[PDB]
C-alpha cells in the first residue's frame, strides 16, 4: 500500500501475493488487497487446517471426531498417510484428501452403501 499506486513492482507483487493466498485458500477472492488487510487471519489459517477442512468436506461429522480419526490414522492426503492434525490442506489438495487403504471407516461407508466388495 505504501508504494505509489502506478508502480510496476507494486502491481506485480499485488498479483503475486493475492494469487499465493488464493491458491492456499486463505482468501476467497484474488482481486482486492483489503482482503489481506482485514480477511487474512489466523482463523483463516486454522480453518485451512486438516480436521476442519475434512469437517467441511464431510469426511467426518465434527472437528473433534476428525481430529480423533486423523490421530488414529485413517486419513491420507494424496498418497501419504497423515498423522499430524495440523497439516495445512491447500486448495488443490482438498481434492486429494481421502481415506487410507485398509480403512475400517471406508469399510463402514461401503457397508452402509451396500457396496462392500471384499476383494
Amino acid at each position: 500500500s505504501l508504494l505509489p499506486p502506478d508502480n510496476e513492482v507494486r502491481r506485480k507483487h499485488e498479483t503475486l501475493l493475492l494469487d499465493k493466498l488464493y491458491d492456499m485458500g486463505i482468501l476467497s477472492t484474488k482481486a482486492k488487497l483489503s482482503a489481506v488487510e482485514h480477511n487474512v487471519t489466523v482463523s483463516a489459517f486454522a480453518r485451512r487446517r486438516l480436521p476442519v477442512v475434512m469437517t467441511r468436506l464431510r469426511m467426518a461429522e465434527t472437528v473433534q471426531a476428525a481430529t480423533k480419526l486423523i490421530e488414529q490414522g485413517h486419513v491420507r492426503v494424496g498418497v501419504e498417510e497423515v498423522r499430524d492434525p495440523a497439516f495445512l490442506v491447500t486448495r488443490n489438495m482438498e481434492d486429494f484428501v481421502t481415506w487410507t487403504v485398509g480403512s475400517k471407516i471406508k469399510q463402514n461407508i461401503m457397508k452402509y452403501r451396500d457396496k462392500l466388495d471384499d476383494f
Partner: protein, 98 residues
C-alpha cells in the same frame, strides 16, 4: 504454483571443470578430463558480421569472402537472400506545346 520465470544470467569463466568441482585431495576425473575449458569453441570465438573485417563479409558457413572478389551474380544472390530473410521477418506555353 512455483513463481513466474524471471530471467537470470550466470557468468561462467574459461577455467577447467575441476575449478567447478568441490574441494577434495584429488580430482575424480582422469588425466584427459581436466582440460575441458567450460565454454565451447563457439563461445571462445564465433565468426560473425560484428567481428569481421572491413572489406570482407562472412557467410553463413563461417568463411571470410571479400566484396571485391565476389562477382556480380553472387552479389545479386546475396542481396536476394538477405532480402528474403528481411521479408520473412505554371510553366511556359512553349514548354507545354513543344
Amino acid at each position: 504454483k512455483p513463481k513466474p520465470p524471471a530471467p537470470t544470467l550466470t557468468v561462467v569463466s574459461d577455467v577447467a571443470t575441476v575449478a567447478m568441482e568441490d574441494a577434495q585431495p584429488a580430482t575424480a576425473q582422469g588425466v584427459a578430463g581436466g582440460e575441458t575449458s567450460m565454454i565451447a569453441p563457439q563461445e571462445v570465438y564465433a565468426p560473425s558480421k560484428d567481428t569481421a573485417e572491413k572489406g570482407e563479409v562472412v557467410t553463413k558457413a563461417g568463411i571470410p569472402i571479400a566484396k571485391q572478389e565476389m562477382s556480380r551474380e553472387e552479389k545479386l544472390r546475396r542481396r536476394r537472400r538477405e532480402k528474403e530473410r528481411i521479408r520473412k521477418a505554371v510553366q511556359s506555353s512553349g514548354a507545354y506545346k513543344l
